[PDB]
Structure 1
Amino acid sequence: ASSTPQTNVDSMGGDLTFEDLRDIKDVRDSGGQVAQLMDYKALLNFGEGCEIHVEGDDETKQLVDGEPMTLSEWLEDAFPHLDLLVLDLGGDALWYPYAVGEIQETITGEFKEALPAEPWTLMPESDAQGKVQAWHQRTKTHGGYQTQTLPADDLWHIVINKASARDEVGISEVLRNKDEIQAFKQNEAAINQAIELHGFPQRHVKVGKEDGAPVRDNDLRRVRTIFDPRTTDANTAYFTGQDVDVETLEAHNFDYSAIHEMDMRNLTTALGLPLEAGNVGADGLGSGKPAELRFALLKLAIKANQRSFSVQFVERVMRPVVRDYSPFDHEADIRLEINDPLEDIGEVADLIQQVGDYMTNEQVAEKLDLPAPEDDEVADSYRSPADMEKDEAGV
């Protein structure tokens, strides 16, 4: 075969502007309904935290600094607050086409942290192969902007949403769904104005007899003062001649509830969330196989995003950090897993009761989200550690 791709990539970097990036920033920061849904999306994908595994981790045991560590132990010290970083980067990579950042060192040149950069300030510059070669940054500053170019050699970036498996630049969900977002905001604004005009009755006093003597603006000022709603108490009564009519503009009915429900059905579906995330219910869908389907669809979407993020974080952040600031092998089988947000421990407990006889104690500890037992034989064995203890004590 070949060592360079021979099919072409339908693009060159020489797709989107800093204005498109700042539009995403404006949708994000302005809050309300749209921002809250996209925050719920980030929380589902990345809010349940993470765990680091290395295959054959026990064999990695090495004296790092007058003390033994495995590679997993070293990584857990290299990234102490990885749960927060995963939620930040994972959030940014759903809003923007990418999350992006630096590697940083202590003054002594030992590793400090992976530092995220403000993603709306940065755009990639890519070659004819479609690979990112530089990053162009524009930032606000006193009296205008600063601008700079950075080589791709010491930044890293992560892409959840892609045009294709070859796309190194990614897609913003916000820019893709810009039409549905504006359609939602327009209808929400239309309802808000329509409620003020038409949601409340208004008093219409008509003065004078039909085909009688006309009444004029100076006369109506005197009438207005009598009937002024600002002054009117709840149980005010009125006394008039026959030639005064106290009419009402009724609150003219329109189904703003159904319009909100339609807007939310469009927006949630466009953002891939179930309608329930938008505080809106639907008939029949809350039960049985209809529920099980939409919840399976949500969980599958979460797994796809998590798996996509995990790979790129390990490959673009962790492995370079191990290679450049660590005594361990950077080609080791590191995995970052991100937890299932919707896992019911009660269902796992039922499973452990039903089929525990077929599971090693370490598999049970792993499913149950606990540290594995201290003794490798009890960890590796199938019957319960409590059952082995009572036997050890009895015999």
Structure 2
Amino acid sequence: ASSTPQTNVDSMGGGDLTFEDLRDIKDVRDSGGQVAQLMDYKALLNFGEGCEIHVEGDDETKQLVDGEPMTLSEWLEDAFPHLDLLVLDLGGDALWYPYAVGEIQETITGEFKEALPAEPWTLMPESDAQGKVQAWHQRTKTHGGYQTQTLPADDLWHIVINKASARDEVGISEVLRNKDEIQAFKQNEAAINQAIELHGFPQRHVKVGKEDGAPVRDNDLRRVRTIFDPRTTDANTAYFTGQDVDVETLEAHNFDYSAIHEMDMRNLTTALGLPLEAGNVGADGLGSGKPAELRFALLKLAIKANQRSFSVQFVERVMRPVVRDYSPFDHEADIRLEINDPLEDIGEVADLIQQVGDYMTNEQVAEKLDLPAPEDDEVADSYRSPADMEKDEAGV
């Protein structure tokens, strides 16, 4: 076949999105309220439950790093001690913005210090007709003014969850994918807020004079306004009049703002791919059985797809480079990074261990139970429980 591309990728030289569009996403993020909380929930589902680093057959990597042995997983944990939080930041940013982007930072000697995400709204990629990023272009405020620079696609690294196609390197923001729905939610919120002020509360209409009677003017109404004043009226106030004065009622002109709010929240959540429950909106029947379990399946599928999408790119463009550039270990090794299921139940696992432990090794039990495996090979690899091995050892 061939060692280079032969089909084109429908873009070069931009238009796509600008620093202004990036700053729109940022302005959504810091605006707070329900819209921000929904995307923060979207982040907390995908990335809030944390992660673990693994390497396949890691006992084969065992090497003296500085006169004492380590595995590659131990070395990677020294490179990424607090990885859950780096995953939460990058993953969150990659849900807000089309991409996440960062530097690698070094000690004064040149050995690795940390991985460091950059501020995503400040940075935009520039790319070729082949389909690849060639440079990173940055615009930033300072002293209330502005400054601009460009950096190569060489010492920076970047990640893209929401690709336009499998071959893409820029992606699309789920915010910009649903811009109209987001604005419509906020507009309908503003509508309900003002409509409650105007129509949610009864109001008092004092009418003065008789039908076809004597005229009433402003200096007359000013005196009447002073008598029936809502500023100084109280719960037990009573009124005494001639027949030619009426205290009429503007009733609260009832409307189902609740159902409108639910409709808005349903439209926004389904558009953002989120469960309706994250908008705190209820429904009958749908809370139980296969009707429920299907939505939980759809939710878990989306999460697993995102998690695996992130992990592969983080391994391939962050972890492997960090090994390549700073490590005594092989950088082409079978590195792994799992991100946890946010809707896993320990009870389900504990039931499974009782039901089918007779067919799972103690290491397979420990792994499912989220614990380290035993310190002895047959104790880990066997299917008889370690308690069963101990009670027999005490008596045989």
- Normalised-by-shorter TM-score class: over 0.9
Q: Which is worse superposed, 142-151 or 367-376?
A: 142-151
Number of the residue aligned with 1:183: 184
Kindly indicate whether the alpha-carbon contact (under 8 Å) linking 1:205 and 1:247 is maintained by their aligned counterparts in 2.
Answer: yes
* 1:17-57 deviation per Cα after TM superposition (whole angstroms, max 9, x unaligned): 00000000000010001000000000000000000110010
* 1:128-178 deviation per Cα after TM superposition (whole angstroms, max 9, x unaligned): 111001000000112421100000100000000011101110110001100
The Cα of 1:337 is off from its aligned counterpart by 0.4
The answer to whether structure 1 residue 195 and structure 2 residue 191 are counterparts is no
* 1:211-259 deviation per Cα after TM superposition (whole angstroms, max 9, x unaligned): 1001100010000000010101111111111000000111001000000
Q: Secondary structure of 1:229's partner?
A: coil
Q: Secondary structure of 1:115's partner?
A: strand
The Cα of 1:66 is off from its aligned counterpart by 2.3
* 1:180-208 deviation per Cα after TM superposition (whole angstroms, max 9, x unaligned): 00111111110000000000000000001
Q: Which is worse superposed, 196-205 or 64-73?
A: 64-73
Q: Which is worse superposed, 137-146 or 364-373?
A: 137-146
The Cα of 1:360 is off from its aligned counterpart by 0.6
TM norm structure 1:
0.99
The Cα of 1:4 is off from its aligned counterpart by 0.9
> What CA distance in whole angstroms lies between the structure 2 residues aligned with 1:40 and 1:49?
14
> What CA distance in whole angstroms lies between the structure 1 residues aligned with 2:363 and 2:147?
54
Kindly indicate whether the alpha-carbon contact (under 8 Å) linking 1:14 and 1:126 is maintained by their aligned counterparts in 2.
Answer: no
The Cα of 1:10 is off from its aligned counterpart by 1.1
The Cα of 1:284 is off from its aligned counterpart by 1.5
Kindly indicate whether the alpha-carbon contact (under 8 Å) linking 2:11 and 2:128 is maintained by their aligned counterparts in 1.
Answer: no
Change (3 A) 1:226 1:112: same
Percentage identity across paired residues of the two chains: 100
Kindly indicate whether the alpha-carbon contact (under 8 Å) linking 1:14 and 1:125 is maintained by their aligned counterparts in 2.
Answer: no
Number of the residue aligned with 1:228: 229
Q: Secondary structure of 2:231's partner?
A: helix
Kindly indicate whether the alpha-carbon contact (under 8 Å) linking 2:10 and 2:129 is maintained by their aligned counterparts in 1.
Answer: no
1:65-80 aligned within 5 A: 65-80=66-81
The Cα of 1:14 is off from its aligned counterpart by 7.1
Kindly indicate whether the alpha-carbon contact (under 8 Å) linking 1:124 and 1:135 is maintained by their aligned counterparts in 2.
Answer: yes
Q: Secondary structure of 2:357's partner?
A: helix
The Cα of 1:108 is off from its aligned counterpart by 1.2
TM norm structure 2:
0.99
* 1:98-127 deviation per Cα after TM superposition (whole angstroms, max 9, x unaligned): 010001101111101110000000000101
Moved over 6 A (4+): none
Number of the residue aligned with 1:362: 363
Length, aligned pairs only: 395
* 1:66-100 deviation per Cα after TM superposition (whole angstroms, max 9, x unaligned): 22100000101110110100000000000000010
> What CA distance in whole angstroms lies between the structure 1 residues aligned with 2:331 and 2:395?
48
> What CA distance in whole angstroms lies between the structure 2 residues aligned with 1:393 and 1:363?
25
Q: Which is worse superposed, 138-147 or 355-364?
A: 138-147
Q: Secondary structure of 1:167's partner?
A: coil
CA RMSD between the two structures: 0.7
> What CA distance in whole angstroms lies between the structure 2 residues aligned with 1:182 and 1:323?
46
Kindly indicate whether the alpha-carbon contact (under 8 Å) linking 2:8 and 2:131 is maintained by their aligned counterparts in 1.
Answer: no
Kindly indicate whether the alpha-carbon contact (under 8 Å) linking 1:48 and 1:340 is maintained by their aligned counterparts in 2.
Answer: yes
Q: Secondary structure of 1:231's partner?
A: coil
Q: Secondary structure of 2:125's partner?
A: strand
The answer to whether structure 1 residue 4 and structure 2 residue 33 are counterparts is no
Kindly indicate whether the alpha-carbon contact (under 8 Å) linking 1:42 and 1:94 is maintained by their aligned counterparts in 2.
Answer: yes
> What CA distance in whole angstroms lies between the structure 1 residues aligned with 2:15 and 2:214?
78
Q: Extract unaligned runs of 5+ from structure 2.
A: none
> What CA distance in whole angstroms lies between the structure 2 residues aligned with 1:382 and 1:291?
35
